[PDB]
Amino acid sequence: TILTTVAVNGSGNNTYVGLPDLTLQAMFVPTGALTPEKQDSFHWQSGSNASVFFKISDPPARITIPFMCINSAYSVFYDGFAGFEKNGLYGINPADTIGNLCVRIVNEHQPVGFTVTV
Amino acid sequence: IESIIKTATDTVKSEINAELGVVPSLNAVETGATSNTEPEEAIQTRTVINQHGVSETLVENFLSRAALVSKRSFEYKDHTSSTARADKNFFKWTINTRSFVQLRRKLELFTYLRFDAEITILTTVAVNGSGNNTYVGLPDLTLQAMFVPTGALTPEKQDSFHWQSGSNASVFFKISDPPARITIPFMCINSAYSVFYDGFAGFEKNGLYGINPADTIGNLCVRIVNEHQPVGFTVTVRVYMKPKHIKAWAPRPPRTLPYMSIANANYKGKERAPNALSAIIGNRDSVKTMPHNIVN
Amino acid sequence: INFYKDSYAASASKQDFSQDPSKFTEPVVEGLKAGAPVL
Amino acid sequence: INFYKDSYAASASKQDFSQDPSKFTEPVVEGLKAGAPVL
Amino acid sequence: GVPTYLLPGSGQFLTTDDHSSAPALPCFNPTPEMHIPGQVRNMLEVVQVESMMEINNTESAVGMERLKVDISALTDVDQLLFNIPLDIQLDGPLRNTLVGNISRYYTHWSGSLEMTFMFCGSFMAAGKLILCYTPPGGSCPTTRETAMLGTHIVWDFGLQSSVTLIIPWISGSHYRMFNNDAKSTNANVGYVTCFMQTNLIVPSESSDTCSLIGFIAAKDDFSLRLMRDSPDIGQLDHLHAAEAAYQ
Amino acid sequence: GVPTYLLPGSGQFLTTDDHSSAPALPCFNPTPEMHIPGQVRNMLEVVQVE
Amino acid sequence: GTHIVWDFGLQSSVTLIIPWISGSHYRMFNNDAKSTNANVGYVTCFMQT
Amino acid sequence: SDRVLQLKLGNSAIVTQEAANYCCAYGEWPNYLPDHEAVAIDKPTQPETATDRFYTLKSVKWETGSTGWWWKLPDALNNIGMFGQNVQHHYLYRSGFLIHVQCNATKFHQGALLVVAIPEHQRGAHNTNTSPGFDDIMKGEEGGTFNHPYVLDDGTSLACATIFPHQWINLRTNNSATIVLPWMNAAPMDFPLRHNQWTLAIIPVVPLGTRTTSSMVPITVSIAPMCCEFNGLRHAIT
Amino acid sequence: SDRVLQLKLGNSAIVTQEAANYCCAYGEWPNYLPDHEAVAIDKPTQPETATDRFYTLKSVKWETGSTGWWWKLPDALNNIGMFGQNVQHHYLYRSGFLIHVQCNATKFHQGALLVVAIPEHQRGAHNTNTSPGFDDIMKGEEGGTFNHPYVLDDGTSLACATIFPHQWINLRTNNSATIVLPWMNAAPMDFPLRHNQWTLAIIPVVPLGTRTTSSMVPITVSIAPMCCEFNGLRHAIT
Ligand SMILES: Cc1cc(-c2noc(C(F)(F)F)n2)ccc1OCCCc1cc(C(=O)N(C)C)no1
Ligand SMILES: Cc1cc(-c2noc(C(F)(F)F)n2)ccc1OCCCc1cc(C(=O)N(C)C)no1
């Protein structure tokens, strides 16, 4: 469940004009996929990535992610190293790697600034 | 032979083999057939009951995903002193699936495709800051998307009488509503779309190459129904298409070099590998060099 | 849930598990047998 | 109410009342009897 | 009326949703279906088709030169000829293949692969090679005596021009991951190496250098999961003539 | 269509609600289950341990 | 090798079995103690705790 | 049993003693258009042996720097024999093809040719936004040559061309390749002068090589239309 | 009847006359990997008596200020006997364990050792944000010692360690502890050189004490792998 709130920036422009009803995009980027580098990146076209577009005025967006571990269960604790060399991270099972959640405001910026909390 | 496949095949345990006249590991690539060597014949295997599903690679699942196909921004304002090239509170788009590479490449994995298209239209607005860099709020505008088929007249202005849409299918939607959605049926004059067309569209010699006229769709015309406000806004319309009820034929080698145009398959390649005209795969020092060799 | 009158309005069909890979892996007139030399 | 095609979309399952605490309270090869000394 | 309440997620646009939607053209009759050869219903059928590996991905090789490996007569025994990285996610010889291209639209994979090599020397050329698959854990073997301890096939050139090396699915986990950490225990598959078994021996009138073409495909125990956008294609600007669609 | 009206509580996000929700990954096949020792189904089994 | 860990207690005695492990059916009582037809191996005793 | 083959169509026959097998594209065989799939209502003409026969095109020379060759169908046959006349006198045509590619050398020679039939081989142009012109595409009986066979002159990969119906001519193994092509089109019939259903590509993945005294090594293509039918009779257009 | 026990595996046997019982972790017994749970398709090697036997590690001395000891499996056995050789020559391994801990003293001695097998005992570091390094975790046959047994060196509690399979060696009661460990992993098999399924911890909750003439009081660990199988044969790596 993704919940979004907005507030008008008061720094210097400490004037209130109202809260815009913005559209947001949450894209699930799995392991090995490229993550967007800017708000207008062409990666947002999401040819195969699952993306959800939702509005601030809507009820919070919701989706179900299935059990996606490459094993039969997630390893809450992992007494091992993630790589075949000796410099890999300890205590994180690579089988449980999920990926990246990428969230952008679809709307182009307005003349004034806002703070968006996801 | 055709069969119903829901999971990856199981493995059967195998024993030592020493049989004159039997060489399952040898093949004849020249015939054009892929090697039929089984793991049980190459090594000694155990029994494995494979429960791995194959549904996620179904063509329907592979292609039935909403993908961006059109993105147009235009100014919503009084256009009395606008240039002739400016979108004056409306735009028209000749429908095509070749403008955004992620969907185009996946579609071009096949020669022929038959599907219905679910169309989702997403709209966003922003206050213009040029000179009038003041924010007053975002209006909840009404938009009209009209599908203009081949031979029909397209609107020439925001208040054109063509928008009355006597027979054209039009959808009126608000920015505050969830994105508008409609299904367009498979409308090709043939049994399937020609993803690639090795031919010319006309009976003369000056017709366009590589576009089958049987697959011509038409124009999508989108306008703001509201008359302009005293201040200007920038409206961005995004159109997403999701194929469904899909049938596909004759898979093809994937596109490797970057796309150059929506009108052809012209290629240039990157300046250097990977995906260069003379080197698709990135280089390594030699054929005996392991790029990511594990040492200790 | 499809209350529309036109069948093409329906949701996606993800239940066609029929396969025939031999169309692309073995499109030869004479089928090859396991173990026996191809040539 | 689940009209989704994928089973993992369903709501929670709170009807598994099976228990076996002996896995943690009595994981010994020789079961102990009531009253009789353990040792 | 019916009392109702809206759930979280109401009004959202999920690109992977599956619902009916309003037909824009009522009573439209689509063109009758016609039989067309080569129908594909599951992408796993495509990955089962052999395609050439780019083993010779070196700066000296241009165009289709990168699709063949040259072998010559040697004067020392048991010499290494070439090796093949087995990582599909990284940019290697397996990336631009049917199996590689299709798999890179997904994140997880499982099942056996098969490598087939065709010897394209003259009829008079003779030789024996050993093709080895080394499960992961150590460095890629550099000597025949070490490489031959793993899975391998000894290939004798002859009337049957092609041999198949099976790369069996040997994995601790049900699936592996196409992740950019090629040394991860969830991704590394191991190595494939090729050594001279005896030598390439040709008469004076035959070419002293002969070429092999390597092919790769997945067996019917192969499967993929977790669709993702392929990193093999991208755009930084609009394609030419795309703007003209709006004119 | 069906005449409807929205009740109080419509659109709320209750952290303890129990509903189905849209699958983000259609046709995904989870890894087959494997027997693992020490399964716990009710937390009262844990509190019974000394 | 073959061994038994012996815990001192009420039973005062432990038995180490030297199983017949031989390539040949019989061994020989020959003065060459290092002959492959005669040598039986060794028995050693270490502190366990 | 699989190395010797004789193909007989109409008044033409071909024998090879060094075949591997032959490929039936997508496991299909050519056939006439059935009633439940027909569109044109006029009675079609089916010349049979007059058109369903082997036509041999001009041979090409396999050189060291050869990049490969292609022929588009039915364009390559549109001016040959009674097939050409029927094509010129009719608005619609339909047919399969039987392709036999011939190349022989000595046991001291080496080389490998990929013989692949590409459906709808829409060509791209190199380093330009302009689409290929009519003269670039329609080469007729002489055919064309690949500018960049590595990417199949279309921005794709040669390595993945094996997804298409294909054989190989590996000089040490065989001296001929045979491919049977069914009708491959989105429509039951087509105008033969503006659309090409199939492209035959012969690409030397392994260059010709030898150390014996060199000789000209030609590659010869023979194509027999199968189950030809024509609709919409009128005056000759060509 | 429950104080005397003999364990025989392969060519090794152990007898204790002061046992309490023995613990089967989560009420399970080791077994080979079944066909309906296998993943690797190569035929596994099952050495049986060559590897399924008792290996005795180096004894440690129980002192007044001892904080406790631990050994990680299979790391501790990865260089011992044929088990070590099979581990070094194979990419995948799978096995249970039979653990026998030995510690004897006099009737004038007192002390209590908690003998617990911790599944996936991921260790934490004290007073630093840096994760434990390879050398901190992989100690091999020598094992390690607890820095802060009170929190199990992982920020948890020692008092709640009884949730794990465990026994006690209470000097007045018994002189040995026995625990049988099944395969405990999210995957059917694993790479033995990078992941440890079990950690054996021996922690002196009650310190060793006596007023009689003092003697060295060692603690000895003997571990027998059970139902070992290995897949993915290659050259030795170690
Ligand atoms: C938080 C989240 C968000 C998204 C998402 N957001 O947007 C979208 C989009 F694009 F479709 F719209 N997808 C996807 C997946 C997510 O997490 C998965 C939780 C799984 C897990 C593993 C473990 C673990 O390692 N254990 C228990 C040891 N815990 O939990
Ligand atoms: C994007 C779109 C939007 C609308 C629309 N928008 O609004 C309305 C209105 F007025 F009713 F409200 N209609 C209609 C149709 C559209 O596209 C049809 C996709 C079909 C196709 C052919 C090929 C192809 O040539 N291939 C595969 C080789 N690809 O896809």
TrEMBL record, chain A:
The listed locations are:
Host cytoplasmic vesicle membrane; Host nucleus; Virion
Q: Which residues form a coiled coil?
A: none
Q: Which domain of life is it from?
A: Viruses
* Oligomer status and interactors: Interacts with capsid protein VP1 and capsid protein VP3 in the mature capsid.
Describe the function of this protein.
Protein 3CD: Involved in the viral replication complex and viral polypeptide maturation. It exhibits protease activity with a specificity and catalytic efficiency that is different from protease 3C. Protein 3CD lacks polymerase activity. Protein 3CD binds to the 5'UTR of the viral genome. RNA-directed RNA polymerase: Replicates the viral genomic RNA on the surface of intracellular membranes. May form linear arrays of subunits that propagate along a strong head-to-tail interaction called interface-I. Covalently attaches UMP to a tyrosine of VPg, which is used to prime RNA synthesis. The positive stranded RNA genome is first replicated at virus induced membranous vesicles, creating a dsRNA genomic replication form. This dsRNA is then used as template to synthesize positive stranded RNA genomes. ss(+)RNA genomes are either translated, replicated or encapsidated.
Q: According to its UniProt record, which protein family does this protein belong to?
A: Belongs to the picornaviruses polyprotein family.
Its protein name is: Genome polyprotein
